[PDB]
Amino acid sequence: SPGVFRVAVSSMISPLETMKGYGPVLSYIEQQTGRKVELVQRRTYREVNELIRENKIDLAFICTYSFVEAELFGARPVAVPQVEGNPYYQAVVITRRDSGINSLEELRNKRFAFTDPMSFSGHIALRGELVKVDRTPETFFASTFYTYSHDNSLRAVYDGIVDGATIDSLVFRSSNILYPEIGAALQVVHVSPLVGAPPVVVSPGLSEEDYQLIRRAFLNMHNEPLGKQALDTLFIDRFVMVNSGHYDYIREIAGKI
Template identity: 40%
Template sequence: MRNRFIMMLVLAMFLVAGCGNQTRPFIDFSKPQPVDKNSSYATLDQRPIRIALATVISPNETIAHYRKIAEYISRHMGRPAVLIQRKTYEEVNMLLSNGEVDLAFMSTGAFCAYRGLTEIELLSMVEHNQTTLYKAQIIVHKDSDIHSFADLKGHTFAFTDPLSYSGHMAILELLKPQNIRPEQYFSRYLYTYSHDKSIWAVATKAVEAASLDSMIFDYAQARTPELTANLRTISYIGPLPTGPVVINKTLSSDQKDQLRTIFRNMHQDPQMKPVLSGLLIDRFVLPNAELYRPLQKIYDQSGGLT
């Protein structure tokens, strides 16, 4: 009897709560909201420029450098800049698709996989060691008896991000001729969502192998040689184009021109040289869209593999 009374009381409270919706604020997202003409950000050219990134090196290593770039853009555009950091490439792609950012630092794979609702344009691409190309690099522990990709069957593996080319799709492409999926080829696999975490996972034998960006491996060799000394490379895949900087296509022509000039000249500023170096960037150069076409076709054809 007591239990029945408690249940009836809870039900009554629920119904009362359900009847109170009239007093709650309601936002109809299907109706455009008017812009306050008195707002300091009344026009697109006045509001903060929104910059997105997903860190491929551990956030503590890179976020300070990206803040400096955001500040540099802000100074040269004469408007505030907002830096939006996300953990995964998909999250950044969603921000772009929803029109929630104006500019994004993208990985090669994330750009080639992008099929969002909002159109984007290539602004620039990264040049490192006088080239805009890099490779996917498959690493194992130095003590491992694995010497080729064929030897990896039945072993553990670390991917970086589902949308990464060097850290994921490149491996799926190696498996495609065999019509086999990663879960059938490897005994276990995981995603680290960071290239340097993949390096750590192999160096500490948390997994037996990983695939990652060769530029980041070179960076790790310079920064943490005691870690990479425990590793060995068994294969390279590539060359591949470096990750681009993209912009929302709806930006005004003046804004696009401003941003192109800013990125083209950034490396000439003495204060920005160490910032760019900390991100494995010598300078930003004009993008070559044709370099990405073959990889875009791979993502088009990947179907359920991604």
């Protein structure tokens, strides 16, 4: 009798390994709710946000900028991940060490990779920064491309297809371990201000009781056997309460457009 519980995620973070990564947390949500869980994947964060707006899903793992837009149509924050190292989050701008392009400023009239249009670390951080010099990516760079992948943006800089890219600090860190030939060739030439971890949200339609039940389940996940397995599989220490202030920098550059 309980209705299906739908969880939306981006298909482009871990191609071919998304159900592999999320499977245990979907099983945890089934244990805590008694509802069958369906994983809903989309290539773009615009598509995921429209599913949230239309109440076509219950819960979504969205990126930070997606969250700023989603809150304005009544998406409610559940919790934020705390990752091993209890890290901080920023956009890093990367070039090749051998490019002779040693600053964000020197990428004027150069080729640049973004990820998703609705990504902070993959797009909006750079668009926001360029307002300071009365420019947009289109009027600052020779050309831009949306790769829809932090890893593919990284690869495009490595292969000399673009001169620079903006990507997630955590993805750069993780990629430098996995791919050391690529790591060795790349340099961070600019870092953005710090912002909060990407929040988990529920759709505006979900009941107050369902919201409270799911929030409790996330905030208590690290104390449950199935929850610990879910956290280990996503390489997350635990989920903690959202601090709205952590996204105020994103809200401010969003307003300057």
